Amino acid sequence: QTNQLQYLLRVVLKTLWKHQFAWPFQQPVDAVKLNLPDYYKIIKTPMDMGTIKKRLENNYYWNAQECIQDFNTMFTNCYIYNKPGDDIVLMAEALEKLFLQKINELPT
Ligand SMILES: Cc1cc(F)cc(C)c1Oc1ccc(C(C)(C)O)cc1-c1cn(C)c(=O)c2cc(-c3cnc(-c4ccccc4)[nH]3)oc12
């Protein structure tokens, strides 16, 4: 409607969260459970919709552009660590496309 961060929480995040392919990005990549010793060495700034959701609820972000940066970090993190063509990458790509659709309808 008017405030940007409100939009990001109530519209953008809700849409991405409901999506079929959301579940692997709803919490930090648990690198112990998954047997990934190198993840937290390669990915300097980890990110998930879980953490973004927390930050929107907890008046953490200075402004919408900081939150959008985190969404991009989540996607690019996935594309850095994983081989192009992997299942997880196609899922990230699907969410990214939808993310960018919803970001165009953003108030100002
Ligand atoms: C989405 C998905 C499908 C699948 F069939 C198998 C896995 C591991 C998978 O990814 C995850 C499943 C669960 C979780 C939880 C919820 C436990 O955190 C995370 C992932 C997962 C999420 N993200 C964002 C990743 O980038 C990633 C990478 C891996 C991964 C696990 N093992 C590998 C891998 C390592 C070396 C060689 C080949 C694959 N990659 O798993 C995930």
XYZ file of C-alpha atoms and ligand atoms in Angstrom:
150
model
C 0.000 0.000 0.000
C 2.515 2.743 1.197
C 5.506 1.627 3.468
C 8.026 -0.583 1.588
C 9.171 -2.940 4.423
C 5.457 -3.584 5.317
C 4.990 -4.635 1.623
C 8.119 -6.896 1.745
C 6.713 -8.749 4.832
C 2.964 -8.945 3.985
C 3.198 -9.432 0.158
C 6.735 -10.409 -1.070
C 7.788 -12.774 1.805
C 4.257 -14.297 2.213
C 4.225 -15.138 -1.579
C 7.748 -16.711 -1.558
C 7.011 -18.572 1.741
C 3.776 -20.207 0.344
C 5.625 -21.312 -2.894
C 6.236 -25.088 -3.426
C 10.060 -24.686 -3.566
C 10.340 -22.411 -0.439
C 11.074 -25.123 2.202
C 14.909 -25.438 1.689
C 15.247 -21.606 2.086
C 12.953 -21.233 5.190
C 15.851 -21.833 7.672
C 19.678 -21.605 7.636
C 21.469 -24.366 5.670
C 22.228 -26.781 8.597
C 25.738 -27.815 7.417
C 26.172 -30.493 10.190
C 22.861 -32.357 9.354
C 23.736 -32.259 5.591
C 27.492 -33.218 5.923
C 28.791 -29.941 4.384
C 32.019 -28.896 6.216
C 33.026 -26.320 3.504
C 29.641 -24.406 3.348
C 30.314 -21.820 6.129
C 33.927 -21.396 4.800
C 32.708 -20.672 1.176
C 29.517 -18.692 2.147
C 30.761 -15.684 4.210
C 27.183 -14.178 4.563
C 24.568 -16.973 4.995
C 20.859 -16.084 4.401
C 17.383 -17.680 4.397
C 13.758 -16.424 4.284
C 13.639 -17.529 7.995
C 16.233 -14.882 9.026
C 14.741 -12.246 6.619
C 11.266 -12.874 8.198
C 12.783 -12.452 11.729
C 14.483 -9.155 10.655
C 11.222 -7.746 9.156
C 9.279 -8.621 12.373
C 12.091 -7.206 14.597
C 12.521 -3.720 12.978
C 16.140 -4.743 12.198
C 16.437 -3.418 8.581
C 17.391 0.300 8.165
C 15.287 0.321 4.924
C 13.779 -1.892 2.149
C 17.028 -1.884 0.084
C 18.898 -3.682 2.951
C 16.157 -6.404 3.038
C 16.217 -6.805 -0.814
C 20.053 -7.161 -0.540
C 19.445 -10.130 1.865
C 17.013 -11.813 -0.616
C 19.719 -11.466 -3.349
C 22.429 -12.796 -0.917
C 20.186 -15.897 -0.336
C 19.872 -16.557 -4.121
C 23.560 -15.784 -5.041
C 24.692 -17.897 -1.984
C 22.783 -20.888 -3.461
C 24.284 -20.237 -6.987
C 27.880 -19.877 -5.553
C 27.860 -23.138 -3.484
C 25.825 -25.410 -5.847
C 26.663 -26.601 -9.422
C 24.476 -24.922 -12.123
C 21.694 -27.431 -13.024
C 21.392 -28.943 -9.456
C 17.775 -29.350 -8.101
C 18.306 -26.642 -5.373
C 19.531 -24.089 -8.039
C 16.365 -24.556 -10.227
C 14.271 -24.051 -7.033
C 16.263 -20.838 -6.179
C 15.870 -19.605 -9.827
C 12.043 -20.160 -9.615
C 11.837 -18.181 -6.302
C 14.171 -15.433 -7.704
C 11.892 -14.961 -10.801
C 8.806 -14.644 -8.513
C 10.759 -12.382 -6.070
C 11.606 -9.966 -8.952
C 7.960 -10.002 -10.256
C 6.641 -9.024 -6.767
C 9.468 -6.390 -6.259
C 8.252 -4.434 -9.397
C 4.791 -3.708 -7.809
C 6.622 -2.038 -4.789
C 5.224 1.313 -3.422
C 7.414 4.517 -3.029
C 16.581 -29.269 -1.855
C 17.220 -30.492 -1.655
C 16.798 -31.599 -2.377
C 17.419 -32.829 -2.189
F 16.969 -33.825 -2.897
C 18.485 -32.987 -1.290
C 18.923 -31.870 -0.571
C 19.973 -31.981 0.322
C 18.273 -30.644 -0.755
O 18.702 -29.535 -0.088
C 18.411 -29.307 1.217
C 17.568 -30.103 1.976
C 17.332 -29.787 3.310
C 17.944 -28.688 3.910
C 17.696 -28.364 5.259
C 16.213 -28.015 5.335
C 18.009 -29.525 6.197
O 18.504 -27.257 5.728
C 18.773 -27.891 3.128
C 19.025 -28.194 1.792
C 19.865 -27.318 1.091
C 19.459 -25.992 1.001
N 20.260 -25.091 0.325
C 19.828 -23.688 0.216
C 21.409 -25.506 -0.226
O 22.077 -24.661 -0.821
C 21.796 -26.801 -0.133
C 22.873 -27.479 -0.582
C 22.753 -28.759 -0.197
C 23.579 -29.807 -0.419
C 23.590 -30.908 0.338
N 24.493 -31.735 -0.168
C 25.023 -31.140 -1.231
C 25.985 -31.677 -1.990
C 27.320 -31.606 -1.558
C 28.331 -32.167 -2.334
C 28.003 -32.795 -3.541
C 26.677 -32.875 -3.984
C 25.664 -32.315 -3.201
N 24.463 -29.947 -1.410
O 21.622 -28.879 0.474
C 21.022 -27.685 0.524
